[PDB]
mmCIF file with all atom_site columns, C-alpha atoms and ligand atoms in Angstrom:
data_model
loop_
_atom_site.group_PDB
_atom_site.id
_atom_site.type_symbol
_atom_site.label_atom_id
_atom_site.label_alt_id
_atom_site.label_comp_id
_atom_site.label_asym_id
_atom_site.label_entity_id
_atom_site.label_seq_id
_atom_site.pdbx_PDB_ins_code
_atom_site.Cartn_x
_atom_site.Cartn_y
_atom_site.Cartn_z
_atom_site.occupancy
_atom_site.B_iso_or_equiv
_atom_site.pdbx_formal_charge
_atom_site.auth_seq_id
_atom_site.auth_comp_id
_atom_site.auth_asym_id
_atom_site.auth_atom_id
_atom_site.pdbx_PDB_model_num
ATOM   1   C  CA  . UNK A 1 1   ? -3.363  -16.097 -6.127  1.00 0.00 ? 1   UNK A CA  1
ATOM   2   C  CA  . UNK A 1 2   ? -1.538  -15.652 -2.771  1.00 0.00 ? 2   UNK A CA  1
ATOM   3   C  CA  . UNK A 1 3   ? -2.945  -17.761 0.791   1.00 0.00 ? 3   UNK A CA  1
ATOM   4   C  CA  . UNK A 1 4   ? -2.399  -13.916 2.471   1.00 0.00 ? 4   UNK A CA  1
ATOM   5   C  CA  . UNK A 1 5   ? -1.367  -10.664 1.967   1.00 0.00 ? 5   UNK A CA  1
ATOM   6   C  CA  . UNK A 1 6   ? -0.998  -7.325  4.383   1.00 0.00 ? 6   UNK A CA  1
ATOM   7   C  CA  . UNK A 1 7   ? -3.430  -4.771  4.187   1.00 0.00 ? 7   UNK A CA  1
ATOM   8   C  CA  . UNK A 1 8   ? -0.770  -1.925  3.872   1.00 0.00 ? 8   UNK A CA  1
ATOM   9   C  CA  . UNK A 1 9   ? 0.639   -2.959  0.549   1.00 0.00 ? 9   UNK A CA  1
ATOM   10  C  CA  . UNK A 1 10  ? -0.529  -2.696  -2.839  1.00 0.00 ? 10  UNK A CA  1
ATOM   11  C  CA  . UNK A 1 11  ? -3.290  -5.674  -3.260  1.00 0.00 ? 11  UNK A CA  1
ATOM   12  C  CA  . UNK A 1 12  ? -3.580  -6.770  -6.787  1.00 0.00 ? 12  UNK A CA  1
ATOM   13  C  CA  . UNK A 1 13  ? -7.388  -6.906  -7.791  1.00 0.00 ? 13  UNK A CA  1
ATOM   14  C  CA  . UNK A 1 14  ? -6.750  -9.663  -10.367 1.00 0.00 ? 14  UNK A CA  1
ATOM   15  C  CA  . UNK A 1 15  ? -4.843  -11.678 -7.881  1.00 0.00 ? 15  UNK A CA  1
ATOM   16  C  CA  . UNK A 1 16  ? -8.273  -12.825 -5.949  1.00 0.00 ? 16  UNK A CA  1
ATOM   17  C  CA  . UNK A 1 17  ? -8.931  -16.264 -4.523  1.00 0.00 ? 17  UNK A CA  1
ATOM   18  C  CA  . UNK A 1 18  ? -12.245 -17.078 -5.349  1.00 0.00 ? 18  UNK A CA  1
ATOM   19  C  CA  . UNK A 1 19  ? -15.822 -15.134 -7.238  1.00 0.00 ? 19  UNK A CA  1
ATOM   20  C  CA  . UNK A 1 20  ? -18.988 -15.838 -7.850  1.00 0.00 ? 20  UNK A CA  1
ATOM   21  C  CA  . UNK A 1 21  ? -18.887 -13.952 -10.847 1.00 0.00 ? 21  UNK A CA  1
ATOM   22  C  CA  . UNK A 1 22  ? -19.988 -16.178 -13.910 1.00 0.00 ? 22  UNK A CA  1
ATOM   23  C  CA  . UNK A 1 23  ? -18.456 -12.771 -16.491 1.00 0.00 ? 23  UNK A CA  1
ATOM   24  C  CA  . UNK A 1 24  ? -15.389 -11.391 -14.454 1.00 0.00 ? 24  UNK A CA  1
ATOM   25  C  CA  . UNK A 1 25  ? -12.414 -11.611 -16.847 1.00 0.00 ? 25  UNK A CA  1
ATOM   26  C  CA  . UNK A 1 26  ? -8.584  -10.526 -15.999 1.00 0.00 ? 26  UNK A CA  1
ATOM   27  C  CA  . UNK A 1 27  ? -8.345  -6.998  -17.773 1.00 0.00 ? 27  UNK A CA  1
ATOM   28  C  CA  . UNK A 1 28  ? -5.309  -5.410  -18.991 1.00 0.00 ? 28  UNK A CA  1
ATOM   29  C  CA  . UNK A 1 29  ? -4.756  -1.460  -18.807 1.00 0.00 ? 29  UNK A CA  1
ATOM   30  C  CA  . UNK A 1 30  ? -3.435  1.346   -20.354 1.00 0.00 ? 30  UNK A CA  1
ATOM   31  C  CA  . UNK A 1 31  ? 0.275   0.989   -18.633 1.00 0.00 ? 31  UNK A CA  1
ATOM   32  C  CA  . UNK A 1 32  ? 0.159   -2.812  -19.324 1.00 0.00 ? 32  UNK A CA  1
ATOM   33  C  CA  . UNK A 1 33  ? -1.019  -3.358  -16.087 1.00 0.00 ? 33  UNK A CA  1
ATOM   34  C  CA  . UNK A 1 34  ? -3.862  -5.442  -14.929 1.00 0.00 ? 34  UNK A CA  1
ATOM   35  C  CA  . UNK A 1 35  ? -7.237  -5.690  -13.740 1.00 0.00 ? 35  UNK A CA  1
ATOM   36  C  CA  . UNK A 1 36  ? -10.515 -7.082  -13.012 1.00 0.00 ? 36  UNK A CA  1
ATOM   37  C  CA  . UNK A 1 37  ? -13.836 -6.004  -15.150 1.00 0.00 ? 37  UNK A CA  1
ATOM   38  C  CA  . UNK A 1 38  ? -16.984 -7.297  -17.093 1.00 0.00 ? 38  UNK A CA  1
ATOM   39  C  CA  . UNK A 1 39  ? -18.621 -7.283  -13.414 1.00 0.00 ? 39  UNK A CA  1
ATOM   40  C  CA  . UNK A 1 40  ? -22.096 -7.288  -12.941 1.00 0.00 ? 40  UNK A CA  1
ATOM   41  C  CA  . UNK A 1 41  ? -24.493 -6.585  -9.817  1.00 0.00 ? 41  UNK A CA  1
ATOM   42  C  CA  . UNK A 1 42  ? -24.452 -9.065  -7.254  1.00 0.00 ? 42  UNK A CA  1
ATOM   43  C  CA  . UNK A 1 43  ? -21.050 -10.245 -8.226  1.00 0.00 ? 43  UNK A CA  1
ATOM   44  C  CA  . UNK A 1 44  ? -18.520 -11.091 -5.120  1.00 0.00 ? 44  UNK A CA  1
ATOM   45  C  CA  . UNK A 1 45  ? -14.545 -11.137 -4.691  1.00 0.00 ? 45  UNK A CA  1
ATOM   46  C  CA  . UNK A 1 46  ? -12.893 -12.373 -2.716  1.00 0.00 ? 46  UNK A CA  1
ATOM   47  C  CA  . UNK A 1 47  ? -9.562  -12.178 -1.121  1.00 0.00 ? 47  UNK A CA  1
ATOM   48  C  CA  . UNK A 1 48  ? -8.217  -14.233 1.457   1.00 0.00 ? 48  UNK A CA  1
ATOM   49  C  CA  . UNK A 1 49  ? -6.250  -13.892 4.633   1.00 0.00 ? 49  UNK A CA  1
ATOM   50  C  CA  . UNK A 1 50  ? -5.376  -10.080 4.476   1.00 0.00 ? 50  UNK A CA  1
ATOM   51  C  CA  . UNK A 1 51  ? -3.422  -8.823  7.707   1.00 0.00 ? 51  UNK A CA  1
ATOM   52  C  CA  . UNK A 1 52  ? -4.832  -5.483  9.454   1.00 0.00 ? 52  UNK A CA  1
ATOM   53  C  CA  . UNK A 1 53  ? -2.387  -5.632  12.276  1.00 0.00 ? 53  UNK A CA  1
ATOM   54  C  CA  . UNK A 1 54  ? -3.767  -3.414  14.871  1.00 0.00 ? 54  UNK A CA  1
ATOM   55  C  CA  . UNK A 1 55  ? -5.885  -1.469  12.575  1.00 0.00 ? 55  UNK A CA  1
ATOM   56  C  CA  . UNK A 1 56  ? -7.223  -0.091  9.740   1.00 0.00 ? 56  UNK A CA  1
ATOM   57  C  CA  . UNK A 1 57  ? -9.849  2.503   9.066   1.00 0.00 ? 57  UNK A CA  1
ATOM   58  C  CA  . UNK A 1 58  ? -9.511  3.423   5.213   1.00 0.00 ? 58  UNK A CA  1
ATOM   59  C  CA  . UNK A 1 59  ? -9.650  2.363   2.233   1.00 0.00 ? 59  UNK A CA  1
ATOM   60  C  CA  . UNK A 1 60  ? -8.325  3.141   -1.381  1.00 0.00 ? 60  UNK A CA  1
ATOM   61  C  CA  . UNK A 1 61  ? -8.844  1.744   -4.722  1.00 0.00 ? 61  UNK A CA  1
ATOM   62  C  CA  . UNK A 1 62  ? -7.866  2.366   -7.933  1.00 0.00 ? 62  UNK A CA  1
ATOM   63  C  CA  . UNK A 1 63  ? -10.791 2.144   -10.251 1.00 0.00 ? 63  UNK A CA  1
ATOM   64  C  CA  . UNK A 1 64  ? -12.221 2.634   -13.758 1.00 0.00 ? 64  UNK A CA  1
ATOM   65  C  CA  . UNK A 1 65  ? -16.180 3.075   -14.939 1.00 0.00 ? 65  UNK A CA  1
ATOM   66  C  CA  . UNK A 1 66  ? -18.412 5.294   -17.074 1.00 0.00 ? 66  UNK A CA  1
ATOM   67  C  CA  . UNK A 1 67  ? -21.276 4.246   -14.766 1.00 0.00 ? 67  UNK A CA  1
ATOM   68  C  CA  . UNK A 1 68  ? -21.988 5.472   -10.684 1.00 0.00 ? 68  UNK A CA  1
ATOM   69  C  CA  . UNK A 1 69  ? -21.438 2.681   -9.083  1.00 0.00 ? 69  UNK A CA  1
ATOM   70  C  CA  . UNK A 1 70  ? -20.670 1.443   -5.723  1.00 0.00 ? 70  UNK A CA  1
ATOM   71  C  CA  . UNK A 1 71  ? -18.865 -1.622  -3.954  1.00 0.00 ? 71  UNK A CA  1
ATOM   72  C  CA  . UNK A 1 72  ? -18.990 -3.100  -0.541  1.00 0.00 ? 72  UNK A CA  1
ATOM   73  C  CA  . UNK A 1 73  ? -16.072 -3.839  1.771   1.00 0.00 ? 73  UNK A CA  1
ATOM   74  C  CA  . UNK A 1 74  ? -17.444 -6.736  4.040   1.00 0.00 ? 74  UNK A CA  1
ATOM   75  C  CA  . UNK A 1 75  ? -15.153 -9.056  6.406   1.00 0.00 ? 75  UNK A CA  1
ATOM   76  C  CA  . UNK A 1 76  ? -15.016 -12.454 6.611   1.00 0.00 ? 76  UNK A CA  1
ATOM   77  C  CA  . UNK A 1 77  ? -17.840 -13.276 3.832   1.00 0.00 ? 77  UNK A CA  1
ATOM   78  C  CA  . UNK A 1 78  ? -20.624 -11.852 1.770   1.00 0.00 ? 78  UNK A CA  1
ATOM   79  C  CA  . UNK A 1 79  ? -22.621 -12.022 4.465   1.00 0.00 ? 79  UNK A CA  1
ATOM   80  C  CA  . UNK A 1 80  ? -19.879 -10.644 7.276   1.00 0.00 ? 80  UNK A CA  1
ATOM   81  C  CA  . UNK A 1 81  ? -19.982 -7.243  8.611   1.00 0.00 ? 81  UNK A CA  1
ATOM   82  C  CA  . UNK A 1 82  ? -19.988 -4.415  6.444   1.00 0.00 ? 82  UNK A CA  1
ATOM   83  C  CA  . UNK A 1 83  ? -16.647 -2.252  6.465   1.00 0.00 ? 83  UNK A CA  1
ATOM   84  C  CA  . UNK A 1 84  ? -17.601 0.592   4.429   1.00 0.00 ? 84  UNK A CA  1
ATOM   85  C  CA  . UNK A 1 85  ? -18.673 1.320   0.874   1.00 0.00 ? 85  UNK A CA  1
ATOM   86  C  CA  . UNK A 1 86  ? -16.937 2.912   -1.792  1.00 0.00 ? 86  UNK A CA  1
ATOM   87  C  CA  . UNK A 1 87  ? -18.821 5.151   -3.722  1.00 0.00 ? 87  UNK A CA  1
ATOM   88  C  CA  . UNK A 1 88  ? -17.518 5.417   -7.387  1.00 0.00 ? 88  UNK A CA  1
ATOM   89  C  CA  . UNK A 1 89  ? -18.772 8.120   -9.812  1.00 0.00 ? 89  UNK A CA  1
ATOM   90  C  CA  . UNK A 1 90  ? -18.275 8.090   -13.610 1.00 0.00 ? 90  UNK A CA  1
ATOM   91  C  CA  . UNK A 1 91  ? -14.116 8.284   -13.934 1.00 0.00 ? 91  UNK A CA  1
ATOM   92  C  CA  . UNK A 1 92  ? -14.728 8.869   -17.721 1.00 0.00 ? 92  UNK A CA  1
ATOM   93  C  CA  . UNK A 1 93  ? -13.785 6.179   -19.756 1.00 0.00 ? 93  UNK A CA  1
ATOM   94  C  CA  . UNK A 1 94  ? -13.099 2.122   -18.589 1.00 0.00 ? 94  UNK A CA  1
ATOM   95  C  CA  . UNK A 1 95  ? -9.730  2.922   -19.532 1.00 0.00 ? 95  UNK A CA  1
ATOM   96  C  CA  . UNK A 1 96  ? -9.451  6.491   -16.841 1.00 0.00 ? 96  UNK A CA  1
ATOM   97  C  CA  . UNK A 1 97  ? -8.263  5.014   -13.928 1.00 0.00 ? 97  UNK A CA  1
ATOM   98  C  CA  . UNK A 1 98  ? -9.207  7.223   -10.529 1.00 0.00 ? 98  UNK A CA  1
ATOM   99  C  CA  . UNK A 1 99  ? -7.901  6.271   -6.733  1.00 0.00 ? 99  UNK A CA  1
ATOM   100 C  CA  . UNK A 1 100 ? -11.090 6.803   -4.336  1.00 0.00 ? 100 UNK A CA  1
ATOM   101 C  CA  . UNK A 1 101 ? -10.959 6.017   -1.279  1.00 0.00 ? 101 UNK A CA  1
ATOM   102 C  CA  . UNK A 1 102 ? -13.446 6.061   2.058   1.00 0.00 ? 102 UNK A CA  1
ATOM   103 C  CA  . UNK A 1 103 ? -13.792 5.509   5.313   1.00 0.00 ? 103 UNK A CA  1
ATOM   104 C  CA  . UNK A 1 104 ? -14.072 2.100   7.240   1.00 0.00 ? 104 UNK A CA  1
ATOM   105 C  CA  . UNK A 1 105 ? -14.706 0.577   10.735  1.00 0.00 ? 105 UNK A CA  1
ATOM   106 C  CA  . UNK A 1 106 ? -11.815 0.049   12.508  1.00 0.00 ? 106 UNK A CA  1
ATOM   107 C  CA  . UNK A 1 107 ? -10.548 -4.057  11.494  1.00 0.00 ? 107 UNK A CA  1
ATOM   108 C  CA  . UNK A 1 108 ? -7.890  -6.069  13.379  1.00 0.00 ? 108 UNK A CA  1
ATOM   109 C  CA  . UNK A 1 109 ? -6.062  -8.819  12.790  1.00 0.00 ? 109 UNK A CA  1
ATOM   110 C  CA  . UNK A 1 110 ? -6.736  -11.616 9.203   1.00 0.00 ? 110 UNK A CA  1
ATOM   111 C  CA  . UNK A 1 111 ? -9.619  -11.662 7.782   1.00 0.00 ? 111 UNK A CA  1
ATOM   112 C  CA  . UNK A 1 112 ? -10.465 -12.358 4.112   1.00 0.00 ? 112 UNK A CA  1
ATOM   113 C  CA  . UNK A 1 113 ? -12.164 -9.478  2.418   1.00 0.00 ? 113 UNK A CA  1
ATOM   114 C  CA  . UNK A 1 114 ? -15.096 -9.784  0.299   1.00 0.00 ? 114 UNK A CA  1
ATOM   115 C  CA  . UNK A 1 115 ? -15.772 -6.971  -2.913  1.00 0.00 ? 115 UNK A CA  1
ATOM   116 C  CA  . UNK A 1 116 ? -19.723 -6.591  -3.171  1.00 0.00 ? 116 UNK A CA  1
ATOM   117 C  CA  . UNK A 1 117 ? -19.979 -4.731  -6.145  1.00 0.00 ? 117 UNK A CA  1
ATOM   118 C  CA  . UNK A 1 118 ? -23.316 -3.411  -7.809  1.00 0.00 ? 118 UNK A CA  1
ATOM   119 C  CA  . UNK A 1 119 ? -22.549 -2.758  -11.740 1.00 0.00 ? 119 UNK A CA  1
ATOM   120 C  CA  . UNK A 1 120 ? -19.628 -2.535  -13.966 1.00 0.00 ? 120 UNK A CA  1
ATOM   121 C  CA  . UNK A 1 121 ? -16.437 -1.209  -12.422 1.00 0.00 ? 121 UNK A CA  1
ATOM   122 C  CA  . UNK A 1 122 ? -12.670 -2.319  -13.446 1.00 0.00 ? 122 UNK A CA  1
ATOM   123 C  CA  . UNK A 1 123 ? -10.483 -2.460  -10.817 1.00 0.00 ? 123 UNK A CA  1
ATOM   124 C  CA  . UNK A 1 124 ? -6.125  -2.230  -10.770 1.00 0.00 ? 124 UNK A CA  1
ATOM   125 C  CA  . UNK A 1 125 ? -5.489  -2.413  -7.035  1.00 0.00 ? 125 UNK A CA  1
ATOM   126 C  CA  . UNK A 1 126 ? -5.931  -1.991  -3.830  1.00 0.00 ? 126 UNK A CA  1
ATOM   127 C  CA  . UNK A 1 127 ? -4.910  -0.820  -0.302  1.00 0.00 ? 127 UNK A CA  1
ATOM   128 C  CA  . UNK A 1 128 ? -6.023  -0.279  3.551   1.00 0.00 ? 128 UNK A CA  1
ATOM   129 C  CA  . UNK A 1 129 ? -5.150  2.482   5.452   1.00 0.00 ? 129 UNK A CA  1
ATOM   130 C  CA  . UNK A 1 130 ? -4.426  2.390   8.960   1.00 0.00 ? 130 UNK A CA  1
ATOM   131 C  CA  . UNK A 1 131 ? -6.294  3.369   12.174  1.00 0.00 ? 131 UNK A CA  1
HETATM 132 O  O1  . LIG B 2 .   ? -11.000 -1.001  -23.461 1.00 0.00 ? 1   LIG B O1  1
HETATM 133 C  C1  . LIG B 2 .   ? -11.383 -2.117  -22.659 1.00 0.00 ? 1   LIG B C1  1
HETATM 134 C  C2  . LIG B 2 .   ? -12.434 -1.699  -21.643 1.00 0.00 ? 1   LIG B C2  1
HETATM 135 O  O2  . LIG B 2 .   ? -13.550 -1.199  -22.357 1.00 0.00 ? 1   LIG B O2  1
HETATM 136 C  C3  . LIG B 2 .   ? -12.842 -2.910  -20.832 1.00 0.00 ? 1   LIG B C3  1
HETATM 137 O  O3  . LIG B 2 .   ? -13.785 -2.509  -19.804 1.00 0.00 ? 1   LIG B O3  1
HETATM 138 C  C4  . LIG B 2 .   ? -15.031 -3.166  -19.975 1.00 0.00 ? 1   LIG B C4  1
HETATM 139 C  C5  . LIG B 2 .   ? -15.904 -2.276  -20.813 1.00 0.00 ? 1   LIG B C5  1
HETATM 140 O  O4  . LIG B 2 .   ? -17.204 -2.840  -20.917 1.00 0.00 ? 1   LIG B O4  1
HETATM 141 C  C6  . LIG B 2 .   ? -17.838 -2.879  -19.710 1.00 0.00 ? 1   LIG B C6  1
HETATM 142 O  O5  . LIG B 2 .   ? -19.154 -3.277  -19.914 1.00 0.00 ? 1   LIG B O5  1
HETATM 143 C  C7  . LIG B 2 .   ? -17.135 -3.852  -18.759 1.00 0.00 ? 1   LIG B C7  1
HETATM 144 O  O6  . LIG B 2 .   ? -17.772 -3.814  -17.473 1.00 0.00 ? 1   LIG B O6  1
HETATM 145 C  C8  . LIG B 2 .   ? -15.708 -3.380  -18.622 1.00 0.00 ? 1   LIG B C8  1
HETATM 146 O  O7  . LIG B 2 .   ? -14.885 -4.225  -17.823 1.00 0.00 ? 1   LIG B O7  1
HETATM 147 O  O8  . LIG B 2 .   ? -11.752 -3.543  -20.294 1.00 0.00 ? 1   LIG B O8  1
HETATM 148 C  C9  . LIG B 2 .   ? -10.713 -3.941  -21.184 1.00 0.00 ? 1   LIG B C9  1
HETATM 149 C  C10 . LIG B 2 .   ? -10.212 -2.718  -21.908 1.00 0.00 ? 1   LIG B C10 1
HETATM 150 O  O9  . LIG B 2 .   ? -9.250  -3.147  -22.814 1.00 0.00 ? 1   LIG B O9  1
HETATM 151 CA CA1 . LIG B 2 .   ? -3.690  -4.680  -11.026 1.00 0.00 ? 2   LIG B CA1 1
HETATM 152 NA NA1 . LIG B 2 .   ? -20.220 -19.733 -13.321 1.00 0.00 ? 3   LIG B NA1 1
#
């Protein structure tokens, strides 16, 4: 998986650096695509050394579930400051891909990005939106 990546381009879920996730498989989808699923509560993703430039205060995924779920954005770590949370209702199926996006604090500058996510979810991409 890449050393960095820029927060205004597409950001390959499946292309993450390191999990704690003990279930977390590579998932294809419908357009032959890829993915990350068979997450569970608790589990962590992360992605390292993503460029904000001089800022970004949104941000989009592209997401599958047939359960509400929702997933912290945190900087830096698990533990590191909170960004925002995406909120993710029911999209239909695993295999009905939505883009939701929401609202973040402003970030500068690299910092690896951590995915705190608390049920099932699969998840294409992603991407930051700027300030
Ligand atoms: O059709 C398959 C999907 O069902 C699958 O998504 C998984 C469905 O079971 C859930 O418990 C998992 O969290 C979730 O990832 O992904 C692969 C796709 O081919
Ligand atoms: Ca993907
Ligand atoms: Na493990």
């Amino acid at each position: 998986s890449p050393i960095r990546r820029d927060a205004f381009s597409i950001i390959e879920a499946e292309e993450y650096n390191s999990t704690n996730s003990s279930t977390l498989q590579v998932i294809g989808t419908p357009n032959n695509g890829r993915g990350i699923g068979y997450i569970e509560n608790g589990n962590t993703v992360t992605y390292s050394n993503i460029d904000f430039g001089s800022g970004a205060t949104g941000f989009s995924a592209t997401v599958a579930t047939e359960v509400n779920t929702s997933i912290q954005i945190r900087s830096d770590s698990p533990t590191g400051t909170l960004l925002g949370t995406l909120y993710v209702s029911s999209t239909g199926s695993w295999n009905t891909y939505n883009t939701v996006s929401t609202n973040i604090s402003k970030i500068t500058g690299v910092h690896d990005i951590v995915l705190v996510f608390s049920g099932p979810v699969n998840v294409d991409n992603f991407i930051f939106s700027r300030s």
